[PDB]
Design a protein that fits this description.
The PDB classes it as transport protein. The entry lists the keywords transport protein, Ion Channel, trpm8. The structure is cut from a larger assembly and holds 5 copies of chain A. By secondary structure, chain A is mainly α. Helix content of chain A is 57%, strand content 4%. Chain A has an 8-stranded parallel sheet, with helices on both faces. Chain A is elongated. Chain A starts with a strand and ends with a helix. Chains in contact: A-B, A-C, A-D, C-D, C-E. The structure holds cholesterol hemisuccinate (5 copies) and calcium ion (2 copies). One calcium ion (CA) binds next to helix 28 and helix 30 of chain A.
Chain lengths: 870, 100, 61, 180, 50
């Protein structure tokens, strides 16, 4: 056909046509009983249900049996089937009646203005046309439900659901012959004519109390002998309510279709009276769909028949198919995760279900960003790929593949959960830094910021209890899960919220003050500058006697450079050669306490060229030639700046200068913008300032004395001191090119200055306005916004680098119960998490459900007393 | 919502205009009673063709009935078929305000 | 530099736009911050309770 | 042809229009200071080619758009950058020092307009970029400041002449002492 | 601008349909982005000019 395939049938072998010649066998079958609805109210709720239905049907690969014509819901079903097939597969078979089709032809194309017949729907790719002079559809329901598939967990049987929403005799008959057939699983909705009747009924006269509020205008057209037959059908329909499921109006939530399909498929699976003993099939059925509250209440709340030993095959498929609430349900009902995670189960988890898109993204990290924990997991993931705390190995598996809700479940089963919330933030911040995606990068950084805040509220709860117990957790290697302890693992991943918290900041202050009784006064220790020797063990004093040594190094380097420094290296100059060797040896030690993160630090580069220019200074000095001996002193002079600007970086500990020096490293983008504007304005003004002078040689470098240097002094105030008029050729200029004075203004036959002076004077006054006022004062505003914006961030940054300065710790210097305490407190934490979702409770709509539970009991008890009087 | 409900309850019970769903729709279109026009006229699938839903659609546009334009499209109305070259001509010459 | 001088995509949007227009026209119903609609659903049976007791009042007498 | 497909991205086409423009300004610098003799020399003609390229690149912006090109403010300044340049060649080619020197002054005043195009070129840089557009919001704070400063200059500068007293004052010794 | 409340409401509806197009595209972009970036290049059967 052209506007698909069709066939003109007659009222088993139909299914032989649709499969062996046509399309694939199905693991699902949804059937929407309608078709007389040429008019259909496509409300947004009825639009929501049948759009989520075909998305559900595309996950399993169903057939959809509809009415098949071009009106109402079948037009909408075909439109959502067609858009989902292009972008497993849904086939939308239509079953029409061939006497109601408009323009019958007998590759035929298909095309009165008010005809009562029906146009065929364009987007039903396979149509069935029943001949006459509803029956074969319901017989095709009964044959497919009896069709046996061996590769299923429904017991086979090809799960068939019937969706009832409309009204009329043609569907009310089609619910009876559905229900008279075994396994129809008819699902009704709270919007329609007949489907609102059967929704309300879940007596012969009590039925007719309904269906006149819902169908008032078809019974007046009906005979009295037929409305009892209509009552007789709904008698048989309401006889077996384990095949009827309702989608109520009040449940306008999410997943309302899969909570209605799977509930209907479970109610017709638990009542077969040979599969009610089979709890395994009812669990695997309830695992494909996400119905958790049905799997808990109907399978686990009897203690009927399981051993928690065949709960393992359903656990492995709950991990790899992303069932995070069912992993939690199997652990609540008893499952030893340290016993389930054998060496084989992790091998089947790291070779098959561990996605190689992640594994090639870890292949990127083997050259791009070489870390220390990443090389710990590369031997472990390739251990099983080449085919020990294994519960944390499952946590690595789930956090690498960005499984957010599953990793929160496995995190609660670890023995160090205070630790592993940071190591997951380290692995995730590696993957969010390797950026090939955007939404996957923006979500992997989010989960890294969930587990960081999860570790923060853990430690503040750890620290509000016994703090010496809490501070002892930060030092444990914890049976060598990671490389380092809980404290350093936040440092390698730069978890700045975890170190800006007051627990660690109070810990680092205790470790920095050392054996000194903390909070004496900062002044009194300086007044004090084997009990006398233990004062000189704290790193606060070792820092101070490295400042006093460094200042006295600079004072010697001052006195050598100015008053000393004769032709041969004198007595005090050699002591300076010892003190630079000490600072060379102290940088050898920083090349020995670290390998290459020492070079990753910026300020640990400057102090190397501080020594490298110093040892270059001794090379230029020892030549006994004043052409080179003086240039030895210049290198030592230029080296004094680099050694004195190390006194800035040493005082980033001081708690007062400390935040402000790190604040100073944020202004360098405001300065480089200002220097860019100033340099362009200098060259634009300085070259245009040479509409005054005119020569050809200019030394090649008298230009830079006047184009660059002279507008540079104008920023600090110079203002063209005596070139801009009424300053004649009395001095300062040459006319020739010798001497080094800048050459004269171009002159005339009158020997007058040629420059117009109505141009050069407002040119300087524009330049002096811009770069001295419209520019510098601008820099204050861009400085003033920076201290307004990064101030609350600079505290976390300074508290972060405060760790490394405490971590760093005079030539004699160079050359059970705690686990039980956490186990109680972690248990009260995991309790507090998994009930706070229930302690939210901000709506009484759950209590509204508890109210009406007795109003049915009240009216039913009055119905029972109504039989006793009569 | 009380005037039009009273005017509809004495219009649907005349026993000669209960067959006339067209008059009950044009009555419910002057007043803004949308929930009565959905529940009492469209929720039976009783008698319409969605082909004489066009004259009530054109008066639902020009009299600013935004919830009734939505109600006619929910209950089946091909807007690409309703918008002929003539209907847009009657929409751009007459009801398109010349102040605009 | 002077040499310089001298179907499936529409189907993909149609699914996602449909989930958007669904999400609009039900979020007015998913607001639901007042149980005054549920208050209306409570008293729908209290008339049925008193009326069923009125019907049993005719059976004893 | 993999080495050539590197030189197809517009990031590199932007960079080789900056390097061309900076070397245009460095030539325009060297011509203006050390060169620029009485007749237009060898390197000065290469400058006449490079301004024709920037003229042709503004013809193209008059061809990729009709009148929204003129609606842009910075696409006006670079036209008078060329218009003052072609006026500079007119004042130069006169062989008269009464006019040949004023040809160099126009080329000097044109160097500001070409160098202040390097501000608007670097509005892409993601660091200078927001700050250069921020600079176009200060022009109402500046024009208020220049208004207060100019009224205070005239009020003080004229009242500063309760010192001197004469009748001619060149008509322009006033502005050397009242304003300047 | 010849009116004030009609001007202040026509700019409001222009800022409704702009935020309506913003949340459409962030939903477009949180799905397949190369599909989302291909929408920005279509003339779309020449409804508008561009
Ligand atoms: C010729 C050169 C080599 C001599 C070196 C002179 C300065 C570079 C030195 C000597 C005195 C030093 C200061 C002496 C006192 C302190 C206070 C200290 O701040 C605090 O102690 C915070 C708590 C408090 O307020 O006391 C920070 C460093 C600082 C400013 C020192 C900074 C560097 C200084 C200025
Ligand atoms: C002639 C010269 C050798 C004498 C100059 C004396 C300084 C070399 C001494 C006296 C004051 C000292 C400082 C006093 C206290 C500070 C702040 C201190 O930082 C703190 O965190 C403690 C203060 C606080 O937390 O408020 C680190 C050492 C430091 C810089 C000390 C470094 C060395 C200083 C400058
Ligand atoms: C808007 C405000 C904030 C900026 C201030 C601008 C002044 C600093 C500038 C603009 C015009 C300048 C004047 C323009 C040209 C003259 C004539 C010039 O002398 C000549 O050229 C002689 C010509 C002749 O009279 O024949 C000396 C400088 C002077 C007074 C300038 C003095 C300083 C002035 C006032
Ligand atoms: C005599 C005249 C004609 C010579 C021209 C000198 C300057 C006007 C030029 C040459 C060097 C240029 C700068 C060289 C490096 C860059 C960095 C660039 O910023 C970034 O790349 C942002 C990312 C980063 O931080 O690297 C912005 C332009 C800028 C400042 C350039 C701005 C203009 C400059 C100062
Ligand atoms: C003797 C002269 C010719 C050599 C001077 C070298 C410059 C002409 C070159 C070297 C650095 C270049 C810049 C390096 C990177 C920047 C920023 C770039 O803007 C960006 O968005 C990328 C940077 C970022 O996004 O952080 C645009 C080009 C630009 C200005 C480049 C323009 C031309 C520059 C200044
Ligand atoms: Ca160091
Ligand atoms: Ca331009």
């Amino acid at each position: 056909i052209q506007f698909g395939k069709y066939i003109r049938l007659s009222c088993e072998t139909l299914y032989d046509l649709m499969t062996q010649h046509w399309h694939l066998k199905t693991p699902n079958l949804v059937i929407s009983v309608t078709g007389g609805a040429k008019n259909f109210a496509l409300k947004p709720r009825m639009r929501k249900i049948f759009s989520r239905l075909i998305y559900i049907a595309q996950s399993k690969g169903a057939w959809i049996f509809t009415g098949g014509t071009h009106y109402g819901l079948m037009k909408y079903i075909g439109e959502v089937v067609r858009d989902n097939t292009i972008s497993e597969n849904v086939v939308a078979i239509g079953i029409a009646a061939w006497g109601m089709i408009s323009n019958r032809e007998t590759d035929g194309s298909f095309l009165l203005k008010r005809d009562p017949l029906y146009c065929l729907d364009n987007n039903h790719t396979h149509l069935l046309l029943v001949d006459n002079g509803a029956k074969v559809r319901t017989q095709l329901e009964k044959y497919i439900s009896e069709r046996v598939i061996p590769e299923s967990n429904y017991g086979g049987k090809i799960p068939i659901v019937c969706f009832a929403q409309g009204g009329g005799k043609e569907t009310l008959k089609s619910i009876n012959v559905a229900i008279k057939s075994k396994i129809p699983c008819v699902v009704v909705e709270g919007s329609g004519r007949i489907a609102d009747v059967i929704a309300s009924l879940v007596a012969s006269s009590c039925v007719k109390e309904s269906l006149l509020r819902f169908l008032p205008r078809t019974i007046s057209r009906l005979s009295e002998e037929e409305t009892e037959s209509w009552i007789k059908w709904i008698k048989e329909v309401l006889e077996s309510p384990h095949l009827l499921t309702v989608i109520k109006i009040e449940e306008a939530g999410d997943e309302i279709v899969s909570n209605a399909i799977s509930f209907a498929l479970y109610k017709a699976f638990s009542t077969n009276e040979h599969d009610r003993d089979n709890w395994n099939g009812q669990l695997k059925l309830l695992l494909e769909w996400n119905q958790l509250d049905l799997a808990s209440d109907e399978i686990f709340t009897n203690d009927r028949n399981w051993e928690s030993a065949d709960l393992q095959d359903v656990m492995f498929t709950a991990l790899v198919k992303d069932r995070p609430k069912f992993v939690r349900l199997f652990l609540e009902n008893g499952l030893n995760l340290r016993k389930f995670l054998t060496t084989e189960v992790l091998r089947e988890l790291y070779t098959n279900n561990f996605s190689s898109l992640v594994f090639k993204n870890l292949q990127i990290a083997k050259n791009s960003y070489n870390d220390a924990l990443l090389t710990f997991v590369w031997k472990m993931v390739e251990d099983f790929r080449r085919g020990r705390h294994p519960l944390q190995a499952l946590f690595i598996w789930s956090v690498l593949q960005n499984k957010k809700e599953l990793s929160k479940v496995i995190w609660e089963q670890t023995r160090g959960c205070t630790l592993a919330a940071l190591g997951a933030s380290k692995l995730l911040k590696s993957m969010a830094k390797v950026k090939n995606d955007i939404n996957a990068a923006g979500e992997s950084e989010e989960l890294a910021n969930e587990y960081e805040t999860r570790a923060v509220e853990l430690f503040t709860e750890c620290y509000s209890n016994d703090e010496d117990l809490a501070e002892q957790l930060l030092t444990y290697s914890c049976e060598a899960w990671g490389g380092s302890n809980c404290l350093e693992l936040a440092v390698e991943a730069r978890d700045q919220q975890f170190i800006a918290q007051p627990g660690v900041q109070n810990f680092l202050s205790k470790q920095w003050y050392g054996e000194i009784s903390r909070d004496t006064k900062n002044w009194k220790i300086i007044m004090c500058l084997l009990y006398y020797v233990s004062f000189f063990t704290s790193p606060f004093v070792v820092f101070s006697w490295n400042v006093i040594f460094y200042i006295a190094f600079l004072l010697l380097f001052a006195y050598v450079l100015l008053m000393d420094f004769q032709k041969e290296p004198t007595a005090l100059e050699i002591i300076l050669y010892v003190l630079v060797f000490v600072l060379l040896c102290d940088e050898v030690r920083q090349w020995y306490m670290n390998g290459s993160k020492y070079f990753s630090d910026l300020w640990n580069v400057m102090d190397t060229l501080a020594i490298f220019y110093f040892i270059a200074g001794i090379v230029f000095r020892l030549h006994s030639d004043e052409s080179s001996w003086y240039s030895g002193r210049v290198i030592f002079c230029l080296d004094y700046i680099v050694f004195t600007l190390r006194l800035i970086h040493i005082f980033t500990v001081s708690r007062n200068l400390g935040p402000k020096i790190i604040m100073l490293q944020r202004m360098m983008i405001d300065v480089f913008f200002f220097l860019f504007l100033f340099a362009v304005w200098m060259v634009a003004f300085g070259v245009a300032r040479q509409g005054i002078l005119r020569k050809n040689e200019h030394r090649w470098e008298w230009i830079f004395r006047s184009v660059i240097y002279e507008p540079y002094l104008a920023m600090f105030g110079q203002y063209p001191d005596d070139i801009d008029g009424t300053t004649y050729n009395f001095d300062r200029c040459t006319f020739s090119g010798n001497e080094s004075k800048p050459l004269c203004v171009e002159l005339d036959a009158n020997n007058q200055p040629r420059f117009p002076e109505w141009i050069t004077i407002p040119l300087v006054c524009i330049y002096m306005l811009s770069t001295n006022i419209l520019l510098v004062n601008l820099l204050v505003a861009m400085f003033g916004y920076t201290v307004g914006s990064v101030q609350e961030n600079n505290d976390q940054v300074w508290k972060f680098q405060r760790f490394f300065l405490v971590q760093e710790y005079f030539p004699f210097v160079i050359f059970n119960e705690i686990l039980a305490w956490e186990a109680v407190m972690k248990e009260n934490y995991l309790v507090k998490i998994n009930t706070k979702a229930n302690d939210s409770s901000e709506e009484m709509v759950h209590r509204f459900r508890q109210l009406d539970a007795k109003l049915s009991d009240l009216k039913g008890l009055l119905k029972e007393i109504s039989s006793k009087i009569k």
